[PDB]
């Protein structure tokens, strides 16, 4: 219906730059600094490997059949040739994992031979890790005194080599494998070698890593399904061993020719061949278990640091499973939780079966009719299932390490990358998870992929990564990944939201990084950006990119001048979005750093002038930036600006005005910035300069993913309003009940100067003559809160208003100097933040808020009515009043957006339509005393008629301005000294106050509905400023307050 004029949908100052309780983020504060935990630079190398082999052949030791070793029958060859080949084979077997390392072998050695082997290996790989593989099958079991067994020259005795001496021969960076019976014995010994302490864990200190085959009591298998070399064949030949075990156990074995497993086609590298694809699934499977099973710290040490240790610990998880079947429990030193029968070996078993069937027909002919396994598709689908259902901090996704393996193959690259970004989007915790898995380098390498299929996903991934960890700068530049996004800025690939991301990603690459500045500068990133300057988030970020690109790097500063960046940036200082303007001020501010004119002076003058224009901006966000850019400028021109401060106490006298203006800004964070600028000049080494905040706040947009109860309490208030609009109009309003429903003591010494009844709750807001604010409840008889609107010495209250009444009210507090301060949560006992504060009028200020249009009209003893659009936080218009005397009163019509009424000092009255080219509609005298228009307002209704024109003379003149100039109706409320007027919003009712203690209420036709007489509490005889009268906006309640100390509420029974 028509009553949607009464019920405006505009909401204002409820954006992210105005944020509340647990974030002072909004601006002023610096950005939230992080401290990363995924940082181990030492990609360790195992440089030397020492294979020892104690197997006396046809000579069982006295602790006693399977006897295959390194997949060789040692009884097929004769003992010495047997042992040569096993020596070689087992080298080759390891060699495949770390082929860039030296392998030395020792066959049935002396303790001296093992000494030198170990001593030389330590001397070879100085800091690099040394691997000691030991095989004691043909010698006795390790002892409780901690002893390996070896030989003497003649092979007549078994000699015990004590573990202590090994540990002295090799040192810190080393890893041992023990394929023998009773292997724990060796680890229990190792643990006892050093003095306990030196860690905050189970029991460690050094970098000694240990892998043992079985427990203390246990003995390696004898069954012929296994070899003697089980643990080593798991650890070192995992695929071959994993399948041979699969045959002999699961499918019962005799159907499948087990010797096909030796002859599996292709190589371990080609993921397109059946062997390599099986090898790839195994790596993926194993790595995945380790990730889910372990913690961050241990996983990264074993599974990510050393290519060999990674492989040995991956392949160890297979030993965990195979050895378990043969009465053996293997243990590593970094102990690791139980791995066998994880829900993922199931996936391996399935992939192995599907492989092993196919192997039968692929031998019949090399058809290469090799169907890739579904495994990689299936798992990525399980990652999608996670991303919808349970998609929280409800334990990690498990498939994450498999998504990383997929990035290594074009086969599912796109859908992996897609699903990765989907995962990265849900917050920094997910980025932390991705980067823990080791996503960084593969996603970084992909920044050389020309495939435009990818790029829109890659920018989105790199946006999210850089949103968390700023520090990736260094890598991105070092591989030339900066070029990738500069292309994407210039690319014909549409969508400016994607380009803001591209501009942001570059902003971060550049941010305090001269290697990145220069490398982007060469790549024409100034030119790319300035080409686009000819959507708001994109504009915001084009400026922040450029701002960072010049900053303290004067080669770029020059390149920007001769590319006319001032000429292209400055037009953004007028844009409706504060976020753009503040970013534009940042860019121009960072372009900085007698009678002389060189190129730069022309620029640096033209800059500062265009910034000084924006000193009086309606957004703190902007003013904060202007004050910082002025501080920068001020640093370099102390000399001049001090001489400017001498004569005040060409362009330098402009600056000093603006400093002292900033110093007395309403928003105290802007104020304390202006006071900083003043101290840089010496009014009361770079480190003293305040620092821009706009970059830091904007970046928080990306670190954040890219409702119904909102509308619930919205419709609550609308229903109540519509119902109580009708009830105000259509009720036959009776006489005033002189019995008040309070006479509340404010404790204001001089008394109450203005008040404001709340629509949807039982609240009064009052105001002292020095702008203290109380929030008195009338239904509870209780205070809700107190205040001091601004600590400045010159006080004076002008206006109280509500803003966004229909969803969480914000209290506007206009000061008599034209300062306007808006408060959130004023109703709460202590918590109440200044949302925004600017200075309208640039005296006796008068102000009015028109929620319909979002306009704040303001004026006073000035030639002009100044208009503010609070959606933009911008001074939209200066209307000349055309009076040559002061605006005493100012009412904006709630129904008709743009239209404005104004009462004047000489008794005159004026309409304006502020949206018209000529804004003054008409100008009428009404009442004829030449005293000032104390109060006025539009008649409660849906027309441009007016109650208006209570003059201090005493007459309240009604008038309709569609028809005639003179007065519709006159009422003589008071013989002189009309101190206040209250007109209702919907109910046909008004009231007026006198300086003769007196209040009067009239029907809209003008019947004495009731008189009231505020009496004095002592004989001051100064109830001469009955200053506040104000109705409820949906009921017939009357609040009233004087030059005494009481705020009394009445009603109409």
């Amino acid at each position: 219906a028509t009553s949607m004029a009464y019920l405006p949908q505009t909401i204002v100052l409820c954006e992210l730059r105005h944020d509340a309780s647990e974030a002072s983020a909004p601006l002023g504060t610096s950005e939230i600094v992080l401290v990363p935990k995924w940082r181990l630079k030492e990609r360790m190398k195992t440089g030397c490997v020492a294979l020892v082999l104690c197997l006396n052949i046809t000579v069982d030791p006295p602790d006693v059949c399977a006897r295959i070793e390194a997949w060789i029958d040692p009884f097929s060859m004769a003992p010495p040739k047997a042992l040569e080949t096993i020596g070689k084979n087992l080298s080759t077997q390891y060699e495949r994992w770390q082929p860039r390392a030296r392998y030395k072998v020792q066959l049935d050695p002396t303790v001296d031979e093992v000494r030198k082997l170990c001593l030389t290996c330590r001397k070879y790989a100085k800091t690099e890790r040394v691997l000691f593989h030991y095989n004691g099958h043909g010698v006795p079991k390790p002892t409780a005194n901690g002893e390996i067994w070896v030989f003497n020259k003649s092979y007549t005795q078994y000699i015990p080599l004590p573990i202590s001496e090994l540990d002295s021969w090799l040192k810190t960076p080393s890893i041992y494998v023990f394929d023998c019976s009773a292997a724990r014995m060796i680890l229990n010994a190792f643990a006892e070698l050093h003095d306990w302490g030196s860690s905050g864990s189970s029991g460690s200190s050094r970098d000694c890593i240990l892998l043992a085959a079985c427990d203390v009591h246990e003995t390696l298998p004898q069954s012929v399904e296994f070899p003697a070399d089980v643990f080593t064949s798991c650890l070192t030949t995992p695929i071959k061993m994993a399948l041979k075990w699969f045959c002999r156990r699961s499918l019962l074995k005799e159907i499948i020719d087990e010797s096909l497993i030796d002859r599996i086609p292709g190589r371990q590298n080609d993921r397109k061949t059946l062997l390599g694809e099986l090898n790839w699934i195994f790596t993926a499977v194993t790595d995945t278990i380790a990730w889910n099973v372990l913690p961050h710290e241990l996983f990264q040490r074993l599974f990510r640091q050393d290519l060999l240790v990674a492989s040995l610990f991956r392949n160890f998880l297979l030993a965990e499973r195979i050895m378990r079947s043969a009465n053996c429990n293997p243990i590593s030193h970094p102990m690791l939780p139980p791995t066998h029968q994880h829900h993922m070996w199931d996936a391996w078993d399935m992939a192995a079966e599907i492989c092993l069937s196919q192997l039968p027909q692929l031998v019949l002919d090399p058809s290469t009719e090799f169907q890739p396994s579904p495994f990689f598709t299936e798992q990525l689908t399980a990652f999608e299932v996670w991303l919808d259902h349970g998609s929280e901090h409800k334990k990690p996704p498990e498939q994450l390490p498999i998504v990383l393996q997929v990035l290594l193959s074009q086969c599912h690259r796109f859908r992996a990358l897609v699903l990765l970004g989907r995962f990265l989007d849900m917050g920094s915790w997910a980025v932390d998870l991705a980067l823990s898995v080791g996503i960084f380098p593969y996603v970084l390498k992909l920044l050389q992929t020309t495939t435009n299929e990818l790029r829109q996903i890659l920018v989105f991934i790199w946006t999210k990564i850089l949103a968390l960890d700023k520090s990736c700068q260094i890598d991105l530049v070092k591989d030339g990944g900066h070029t990738y996004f500069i292309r994407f800025l210039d690319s014909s690939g549409a969508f400016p939201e994607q380009r803001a991301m591209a501009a942001f990603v570059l902003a971060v690459i550049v941010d305090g990084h001269r290697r990145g500045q220069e490398a982007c500068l060469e790549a024409n990133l100034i030119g790319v950006c300035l080409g686009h300057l000819e959507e708001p988030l994109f504009l915001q970020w084009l400026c922040l990119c450029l701002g960072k690109l010049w900053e303290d790097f004067m080669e770029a500063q020059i390149m920007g001048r001769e590319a006319n960046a001032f000429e292209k940036l400055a037009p953004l200082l007028s844009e409706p979005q504060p976020e753009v303007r503040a970013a534009a001020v940042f860019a121009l501010g960072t372009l900085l750093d007698e009678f002389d004119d060189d190129e730069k002076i022309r620029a640096e003058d033209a800059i500062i002038k265009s910034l000084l224009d924006v000193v009086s901006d309606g957004s703190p966000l902007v003013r904060a930036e202007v004050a910082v850019a002025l501080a920068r400028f001020a640093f370099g021109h102390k000399q001049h600006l001090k001489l400017a401060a001498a004569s005040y106490w060409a362009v330098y006298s402009q600056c000093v005005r603006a400093m002292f203006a900033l110093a007395k800004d309403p928003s105290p964070r802007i104020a304390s910035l202006g006071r900083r600028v003043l101290s840089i000049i010496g009014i009361e080494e770079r480190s003293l300069l305040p620092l821009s905040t706009i970059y830091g706040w904007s970046c928080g947009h990306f670190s954040k993913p890219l409702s119904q109860e909102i509308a619930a309490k919205r419709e609550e208030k609308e229903k109540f309003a519509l119902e109580h609009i009708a009830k105000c109009q259509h009720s036959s309003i009776s006489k005033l009940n002189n019995n008040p429903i309070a006479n509340w003591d404010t404790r204001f010494e001089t008394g109450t100067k203005t008040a404001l009844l709340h629509p949807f709750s039982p609240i009064v807001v009052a105001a002292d003559e020095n702008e203290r604010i109380r929030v008195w409840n009338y239904e509870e008889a209780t205070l809700l809160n107190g205040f001091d609107n601004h600590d400045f010495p010159d006080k004076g209250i002008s206006k109280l208003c509500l803003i966004n009444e229909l969803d969480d009210s914000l209290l506007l507090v206009a000061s008599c100097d034209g300062s306007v301060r808006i408060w959130k949560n004023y109703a709460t006992k202590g918590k109440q933040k200044l949302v925004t504060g600017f200075s309208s009028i640039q005296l006796n200020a008068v102000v009015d808020w028109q929620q319909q249009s979002g306009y704040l009209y303001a004026s006073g003893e000035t030639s002009t009515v100044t208009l503010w659009d609070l959606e933009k936080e911008q001074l939209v218009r200066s209307v000349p009043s055309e009076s040559e005397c002061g605006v005493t009163a100012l009412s904006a019509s709630q129904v008709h957006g743009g239209q404005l009424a104004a009462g004047f000092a000489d008794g005159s009255l004026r309409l304006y339509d502020v949206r018209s080219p000529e804004p003054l509609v008409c100008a009428t005298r009404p009442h004829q005393k030449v005293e000032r228009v104390v109060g006025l307002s539009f008649q409660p209704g849906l027309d441009p008629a007016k109650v208006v024109s209570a003059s201090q003379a005493g007459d309240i003149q009604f008038l309709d301005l569609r028809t005639t100039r003179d007065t519709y109706l006159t009422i003589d409320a008071h013989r002189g000294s009309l101190t206040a007027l209250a007109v209702h919003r919907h109910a046909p009712i008004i009231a007026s106050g006198s300086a003769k203690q007196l209040i009067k209420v009239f029907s809209l036709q003008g019947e004495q509905l009731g008189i009231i007489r505020y009496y004095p509490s002592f004989m001051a005889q100064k109830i001469g400023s009955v200053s506040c009268l104000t109705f409820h906006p949906y009921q017939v309640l009357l609040a009233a307050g004087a030059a005494d100390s009481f705020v009394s509420i009445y009603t109409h029974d």
Binding site: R271, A310, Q410, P441, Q448
Partner: peptide, 8 residues
């Protein structure tokens, strides 16, 4: 930045 190979 390594450990697992990528095809290029």
């Amino acid at each position: 930045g390594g450990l697992f190979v990528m095809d290029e």
